[PDB]
């Protein structure tokens, strides 16, 4: 009590704030003040247009006695004779509390569910601070998503940051909904969700809301919605609010958060948008040079820590512009994150759901995840053999389509049959068809038995002797 109280006794510290009236410049999304007294870098101001409306913004540069304020909600209609700028005197901060669960917030974090203002427990700077590596522990426990394609060859550990690449016009939303609906552990249900969507159409938002309604999980989650109609500059704020709330919950309440961002492509687009507004050096494809650092800042809030039992997990959703991995967005995202799950077109064109391929997918934490106390030793070797045979089947199919069926050795036809059966039965599963690791692996064993035992190379003899016979 007293320990907590001493941390809050400084609240009763009323401090008047001065509001200037010397707006002396404007262009694009930037506003320029003059004769400001002792500026303060990266603070918050509240404008007041002549009609009484008030917009927010933060200073980005401080010359000698003049601050280049940046406005969020556009700049049209700003007067030079009547506007009145006001200074909060402190950086951007938001209230937080465990009561935010079950509430819906707009892009700026104010409630939009007809409820009252959050009865805050304290305020926190949105940007946060880094975590010293010495106080970090990588995870060693496996989550069971029920999706065989994931829970078999690309496992997920509590603490990982696995993005889900995707292309416009694919059911990534349904995959995310299924994952959140089947987020159980291998083995309570403390998996709070802080879904935070930016720049999305109305139907996606309503679909997500209904999906959360049906599973009786809305009372265990919070929503940060920012549709397309909202201002672009404000877009870059929402993920930071979401991550701040997630880390607060996971490191000051010992919860097990599960955050699922979406459409990081729109966030990068907003970065480009209000980056070319200024004249900073462009990177590749006109993107800012420091997008790598910014994305690192966004992503590098993950994993478990020394003292707190809480955890955290990120599943951001990407939207490749023209189905190219070499695009800068996926490039940097892969450079940062720890493996990712991929989605193809043809598989979707082939009516296969979930249309997940595995050849380009990767997950680093598999090594620590799999083992004995959680799964059978075979786990890793089974996956490796599946990779090898799948690749061989793919190349054999290509070559056969090229030349014909005459040069396809018996092994080639076996590989073609294996590839067909795999892509037709192993991956396909229903919208509500769960698959625990045990039964999924047992089914997977069925597909390999088509091969004669001896050819299997990447699998140790013990596994073949003790499992292939059955």
């Amino acid at each position: 009590f007293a320990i907590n109280k001493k941390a809050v006794e400084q609240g009763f510290n009323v401090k008047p704030r001065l509001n200037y009236n010397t707006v002396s410049g404007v262009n694009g999304p930037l506003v320029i003040l003059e004769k400001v007294k002792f500026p303060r870098y990266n603070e918050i101001v509240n404008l007041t247009l002549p009609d009484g409306t008030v917009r927010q913004g933060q200073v980005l540069e401080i010359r000698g006695d003049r601050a280049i304020v940046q406005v969020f909600e556009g700049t049209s209609g700003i007067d030079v004779k009547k506007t009145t700028v006001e200074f909060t005197g402190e950086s951007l901060r938001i209230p937080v509390s465990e009561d935010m669960l079950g509430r819906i917030f707009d892009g700026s974090g104010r409630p939009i569910d007809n409820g009252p203002k959050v009865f805050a427990e304290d305020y926190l700077d949105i940007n946060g601070s880094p975590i010293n590596p010495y106080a970090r522990i990588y995870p060693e426990e496996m989550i069971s998503t029920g999706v065989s394609a994931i829970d078999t060859m690309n496992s997920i550990a509590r603490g990982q940051k696995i993005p889900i690449f995707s292309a416009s016009g694919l059911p990534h939303n349904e995959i995310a909904a299924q994952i959140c609906r089947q987020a159980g552990l291998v083995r309570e249900e403390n998996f709070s969700i802080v879904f935070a969507a930016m720049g999305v159409n109305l139907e996606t938002a309503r679909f997500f809301k209904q999906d959360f309604e049906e599973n009786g999980s809305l009372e265990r989650t919070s929503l940060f919605l920012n549709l397309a109609n909202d201002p672009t500059i404000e877009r870059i704020i929402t993920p930071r609010l979401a991550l701040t709330t997630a880390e607060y919950l996971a490191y000051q309440t010992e919860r097990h958060v599960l955050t699922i961002l979406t459409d990081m492509s729109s966030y990068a687009d907003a970065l480009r948008e209000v980056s070319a507004a200024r004249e900073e050096v462009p990177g590749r494809r006109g993107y800012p040079g420091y997008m790598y650092t910014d994305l690192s800042t966004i992503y590098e809030r993950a994993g478990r820590v020394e003292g707190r039992n809480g955890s955290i997990t990120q599943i951001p959703i990407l939207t490749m512009p023209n189905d190219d991995i070499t695009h800068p967005i996926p490039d940097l995202t892969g450079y940062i994150t720890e493996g990712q799950i991929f989605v193809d077109r043809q598989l979707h064109n082939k009516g296969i759901y979930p249309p997940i391929n595995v050849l380009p997918s990767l997950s680093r934490l598999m090594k620590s995840a799999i083992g004995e106390g959680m799964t059978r030793k075979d786990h890793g070797d089974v996956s490796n053999q599946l990779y090898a045979k799948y690749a061989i089947g793919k190349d054999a199919a290509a070559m056969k389509a090229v030349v014909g069926e005459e040069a396809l050795s018996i092994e080639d036809k076996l590989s073609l049959e294996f590839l067909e059966k795999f892509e037709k039965t192993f991956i396909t599963q229903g919208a509500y068809e769960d698959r625990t690791v045990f039964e999924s692996l047992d089914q997977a064993w069925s597909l390999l038995r088509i091969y004669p035992k001896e050819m299997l190379n990447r699998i140790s003899p013990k596994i073949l002797d003790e499992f292939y016979d059955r």
Binding site: Y41, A135, T293, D331, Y387
Partner: protein, 594 residues
């Protein structure tokens, strides 16, 4: 005396009333004394790059000076610990703050100032003459490093007037006094040095001793000499972490300085809690590796500027250890991040760019940095010898090999280990593109090879030509098929696949497939070449290879499984096993072919 802030823009700060400031002089700014580095000077004002977060700074904040450049404190205790980019211990910060974040403006000594060391005097006595770089006593540091030599800092010379006796001291004690023209000299167990100035050295030399890495392909086709440089491009999926970790673990270096410039960060915790139980037998036995390393960690999340000084600190520490005569081997993690930081700083400063937005001096900076590596003879009386061998790992943006940073590096380095993406996707984990990757220390190493393994050089070229011919026949067979293929071509393709599946695959998790000594790989590739040669001889003598291969049978399986032999069994028992396998294979080809 003091200066006031005049303008701020993210990481760049411009002060005023700064007259006595020099260029590159270290400065402390803000009410929390954030560290900076003056860059450009214009009258009263002088641009500063800040090495920490700049949020909430206000115009009018006082600015201080130090009058000395950036420097790192050497001496005992450096090793077995973890430091940030600007030489701040990390465990001490967490313990003192009892937090999980890094409190901005926190200050701690570089080296622990409380513990005491069992010092022993050297061989010099009062009245003797000494010059910079001469040892004057050893210090016990660890069971793995019994002798931690202490040195007289360069550019300091004279005749010793008083020395301390054997005993236990803290590194604050003044254990030596040097009498130059005046008696203004005192020396404790430690000193400092400006990072941007490479440490002096008596003279360089030519490296002619291989840097064993434990990897089959690396040691066989692209050897790395103990004293050279390398480069490891990638495409964020090639899994280059595996080879970095393997060489940091099982290499034969006396010390290693892992440095992380813009890393995922979690790997730092991985190495932190993974190393403490992995023993080495270089000296005595059972000594855990963590008593053989120093980590300079700087995650990509932490401020941009520190990514600059991190690598300088790492290389300076490596040079210091080399000066003791121990063949240290530093290894970087991502050079591209350094170039990105430099580009960002240049662009924010508002200066004309160069190729792909980068500045113009990046090539010169990279060349100067790489030049510090190389074997040499220490500077001092004992005449000890050391060596450094840096191993960078570039990371292009699009995954190709045409970005400016990679092109600049390839003009400097002399060993190239390219990493393909598709091979990694196929789980052929040591995925190295054997088509473009090349080495340059091949010829010089013959002096070692003839003494140790005369036949190795001809055999490596044998395999190289075999692989080249297989790659030349693959496209023709793909575009036509096996219809127009002779028996010899099919033999070549089969042996090429056998090599790609056996001699090129590895996994650092199986006990036997974690470290391959030189002799094991030598014998294995010897056996491979002998098998192919016998097959070619038989088919030339006349036999249907389609018929011959089925009869040959089990010998192919035996050579494929040869790698399963437990390494370090006897070092000669395995030699006898290889001899017996070769003999039985030759007999089989003598009879089975018949």
């Amino acid at each position: 005396e003091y200066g006031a802030i005049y303008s701020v823009s993210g990481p760049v700060v411009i002060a005023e009333n700064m007259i006595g400031c020099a260029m590159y002089e270290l400065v402390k700014v803000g009410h929390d004394n954030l560290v900076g580095e003056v860059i450009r000077i214009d009258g009263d004002k002088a641009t500063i790059q800040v090495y920490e977060e700049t949020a909430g700074l206000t115009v009018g904040d006082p600015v201080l000076r130090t009058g000395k450049p950036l420097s790192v404190e050497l001496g005992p205790g450096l090793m077995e610990t973890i430091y940030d980019g600007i030489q701040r211990p990390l465990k001490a910060i967490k313990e003192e703050s009892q937090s999980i974040y890094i409190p901005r403006g926190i200050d701690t000594p570089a080296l622990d100032r409380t513990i005491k060391w069992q010092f022993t005097p050297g061989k010099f006595q009062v009245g003797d003459h000494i010059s910079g770089g001469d040892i004057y006593g050893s210090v016990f540091e660890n069971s793995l490093i019994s002798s931690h030599k202490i040195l007289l800092p360069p550019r300091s010379r004279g005749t010793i007037t008083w020395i301390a006796p054997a005993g236990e001291y803290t590194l604050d004690e003044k254990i030596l006094e040097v009498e130059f023209d005046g008696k203004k000299s005192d020396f404790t167990l430690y000193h400092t040095w400006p990072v941007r100035v490479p440490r002096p050295v008596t003279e360089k030399l030519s490296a002619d001793y291989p840097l064993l890495t434990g990897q089959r392909v690396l040691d066989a086709l692209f050897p790395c000499v103990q004293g050279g440089t390398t480069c490891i491009p990638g495409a964020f999926g090639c899994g280059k972490t595996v080879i970095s970790q393997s060489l940091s673990k099982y290499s034969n270096s006396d010390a290693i300085i892992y440095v992380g410039c813009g890393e995922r960060g979690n790997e730092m915790a991985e190495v932190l809690m993974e190393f403490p139980e992995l023993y080495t037998e270089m000296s005595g036995t059972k000594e855990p590796i963590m008593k053989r390393t120093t980590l300079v960690a700087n995650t990509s999340n932490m401020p941009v500027a520190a990514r600059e000084a991190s690598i300088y600190t790492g290389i300076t520490l490596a040079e210091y250890f080399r000066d003791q005569g121990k063949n240290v081997s530093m290894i970087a993690d991502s050079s591209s991040r350094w170039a990105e930081a430099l580009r960002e700083i240049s662009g924010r400063l508002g200066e004309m760019p160069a190729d792909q937005g980068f500045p113009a001096y990046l090539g010169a900076k990279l060349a100067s940095f790489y030049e510090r590596a190389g074997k040499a003879v220490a500077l001092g009386s004992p005449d000890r010898t050391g060596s450094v061998s840096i191993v960078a790992a570039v990371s292009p943006a699009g995954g190709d090999f045409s970005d400016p940073v990679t092109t600049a590096t390839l003009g400097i380095t002399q060993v190239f280990w390219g990493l393909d993406k598709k091979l990694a996707q196929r789980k052929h984990f040591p995925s190295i593109n054997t088509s473009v990757s090349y080495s340059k220390y091949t010829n010089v190493l013959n002096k070692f090879y003839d003494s140790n393994y005369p036949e190795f050089p001809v055999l490596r070229d044998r395999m190289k030509e075999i692989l080249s011919n297989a790659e030349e026949l693959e496209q023709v067979v793909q575009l036509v098929g096996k219809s127009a293929l002779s028996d010899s071509d099919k033999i070549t393709l089969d042996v090429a696949t056998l090599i790609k599946e056996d001699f090129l695959q590895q996994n650092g998790y199986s006990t036997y497939d974690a470290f391959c000594p030189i002799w094991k790989t030598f014998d294995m590739m010897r056996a491979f070449i002998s098998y192919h040669d016998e097959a070619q001889k038989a088919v030339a003598n006349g036999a249907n290879w389609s018929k011959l291969a089925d009869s040959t049978g089990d010998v192919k399986h035996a050579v494929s499984s040869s790698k399963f032999f437990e390494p370090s069994r006897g070092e000669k028992e395995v030699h006898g096993e290889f001899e017996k396998l070769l003999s039985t294979m030759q007999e089989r080809f003598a009879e089975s072919t018949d």
